[PDB]
Design a protein around this ligand. Structure first.
Ligand SMILES: OC[C@H]1O[C@@H](O[C@H]2[C@H](O)[C@H](O)[C@H](O[C@H]3[C@H](O)[C@H](O)[C@H](O[C@H]4[C@H](O)[C@H](O)[C@H](O[C@H]5[C@H](O)[C@H](O)[C@H](O)O[C@@H]5CO)O[C@@H]4CO)O[C@@H]3CO)O[C@@H]2CO)[C@@H](O)[C@@H](O)[C@@H]1O
Ligand SMILES: [Zn+2]
Ligand SMILES: [Zn+2]
Ligand SMILES: [Zn+2]
Ligand SMILES: [Zn+2]
Ligand SMILES: [Zn+2]
Ligand SMILES: [Zn+2]
Ligand SMILES: [Zn+2]
Ligand SMILES: [Zn+2]
Ligand SMILES: [Zn+2]
Ligand SMILES: [Zn+2]
Ligand SMILES: [Zn+2]
Ligand SMILES: [Zn+2]
Ligand SMILES: [Zn+2]
Ligand SMILES: [Zn+2]
Ligand SMILES: [Zn+2]
Ligand SMILES: [Zn+2]
Length: 427
């Protein structure tokens, strides 16, 4: 339900909704930005700048840790207790049950990037706050200490580099952040465009493939197998932290900035947070995930968290919400400040944390075929795997089985393949 009769492309900032006085509530996952100590530009600061062209629109910001679970709970209460949230892991088909359509994708495609990401039946329901790549954060000082001269481009190269970090430095070669279910489920984001160079892989190939997690016999250093085995080998070889069950995310940022951690597998949004986390921001870099496909590396551009607007609020509140979202996207500088690509479609400016991406082919997952937009979500749900769905529990299990030598990676992938295989057949 779009109760405002105006779409995002039609909003002209400064002279749409200038009459409005209301209070909107913004839920998001950036707890760090909801504090005055935040090293960068925090939420209060963005809003103050917003209230300089919409001084009558008050923005209250709520943030929760374990945001993935808290936003999903609120969403299912299906009330008007929130105006904007970052969209949690809901099937693309339910969007209309909870969110205002910003406009039709073909029209949104003229004013924002990734317009078809949070889209269903031709309407865009979410706008990425930032465009991010799936890569690895790395401490250049730790890499230098170990004598690493070329960034690793293959899983074998990466393991050999981790070994050198373990042997020659005091750093954790790869810090798992096991305790954060979202940091573990982050590994699902690398198995498609990065592992295959195939934009159709995530939404077409993967849900029509019965055993997608098996080793690729032709290109064994590629495809989902190679990604999950990277994490498995790093742990089983003893190149991750002493005790995965004691990892702490906030202090991991400080440790990494101080050179106590060499690498963390996290999207490009993590680069600024690592930089700001101590002195030595210039020790923090970002590298493509170490998979090469036919002699070229690939990195998918996808949205960070996408702004969704509560279908249940009044017309004035939807208007104010959409204005704020458009301001965040077009005026705030949030994307640039948080290390990412602006979603505004009159701007590209590949942020600075990307020189090591000079020869990487950046890609965006293609949409499913017509009538198959649901297919990946159906297989996912039937398989109980939760690929790219915050089911970080299956990733934690990789860590636990590698560390306790309970199963091989091929046994793990085999189990997953059998759950997946039945789900694909069933759809
Ligand atoms: O399902 C397949 C589907 O994949 C698509 O993929 C998207 C997916 O739908 C989501 O949009 C997802 O969004 C992830 C973001 O890209 C990003 O990685 C995000 O990272 C969060 C992180 O989860 C966590 O909340 C973290 O919180 C921190 C915070 O940053 C700060 O440090 C604070 O101090 O601590 C808190 C922790 O308490 O913040 C990160 C930054 O926002 O995680 C999102 C997932 O939860 O991205 C997927 C991959 O693109 C489409 O491609 C589609 O085609 C396909 O069908
Ligand atoms: Zn005027
Ligand atoms: Zn109005
Ligand atoms: Zn659902
Ligand atoms: Zn449809
Ligand atoms: Zn339909
Ligand atoms: Zn140097
Ligand atoms: Zn090397
Ligand atoms: Zn947990
Ligand atoms: Zn193959
Ligand atoms: Zn190889
Ligand atoms: Zn293949
Ligand atoms: Zn200092
Ligand atoms: Zn330094
Ligand atoms: Zn080849
Ligand atoms: Zn369709
Ligand atoms: Zn199992």
């Amino acid at each position: 339900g779009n109760k405002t009769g105006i779409t995002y492309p039609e909003i002209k900032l400064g002279e749409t909704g200038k009459d409005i006085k209301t209070t909107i509530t913004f839920m998001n996952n950036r707890t760090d930005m909801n504090l005055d100590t935040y090293p960068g530009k925090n939420w209060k600061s963005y809003i103050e700048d917003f209230n300089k062209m919409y001084p009558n629109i008050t923005v209250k910001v709520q943030t929760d840790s374990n945001y993935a679970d808290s936003a999903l709970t609120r969403l299912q209460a299906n009330n008007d207790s929130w105006d904007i949230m970052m969209i949690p892991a809901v099937d693309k088909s339910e969007f209309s049950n909870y969110f205002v359509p910003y406009g039709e994708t073909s029209e949104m495609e003229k004013v924002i990037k990734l317009a078809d990401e949070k889209a269903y039946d031709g309407q865009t329901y979410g706008i990425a706050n930032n465009g991010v790549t799936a890569g690895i954060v790395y401490n250049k000082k730790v890499f230098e200490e170990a004598g690493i001269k070329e960034l690793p481009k293959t899983p074998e190269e990466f393991q050999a580099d981790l070994k050198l970090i373990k042997e020659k430095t005091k750093a954790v070669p790869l810090y798992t952040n096991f305790v954060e279910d979202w940091a573990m489920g982050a590994w699902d984001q690398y198995i498609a465009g990065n592992a295959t160079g195939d934009p159709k892989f995530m939404n077409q190939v993967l849900p029509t493939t019965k055993e997608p997690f098996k080793k690729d016999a032709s290109a064994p250093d590629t495809h989902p197998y190679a990604v999950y085995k990277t994490l498995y080998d790093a742990v089983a070889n003893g190149y991750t932290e002493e005790d995965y069950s004691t990892t702490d995310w906030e202090s991991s940022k400080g440790k990494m900035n101080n050179g106590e951690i060499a690498t963390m597998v996290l999207g490009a949004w993590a680069v600024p947070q690592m930089k700001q986390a101590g002195d030595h921001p210039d020790d923090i870099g970002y590298m493509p995930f170490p998979i090469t496909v036919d002699g070229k590396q690939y990195a998918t551009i996808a949205g960070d968290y996408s702004y969704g607007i509560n279908k249940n609020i009044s017309k004035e509140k939807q208007e104010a919400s959409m204005i704020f979202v458009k301001w965040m996207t077009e005026d705030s500088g949030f994307a640039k400040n948080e290390g990412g690509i602006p979603i505004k479609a009159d701007d590209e400016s590949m942020p600075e944390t990307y020189e090591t991406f000079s020869d990487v082919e950046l890609i965006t997952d293609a949409p499913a075929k017509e009538g198959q937009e649901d297919l990946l979500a159906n297989v996912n749900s039937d398989s109980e795997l939760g690929i790219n769905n915050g089911n970080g529990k299956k990733i934690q299990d990789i860590v636990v089985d590698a560390a306790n030598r309970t199963r091989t990676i091929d046994q793990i992938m085999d189990e997953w393949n059998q759950k997946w295989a039945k789900a694909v057949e069933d759809n």
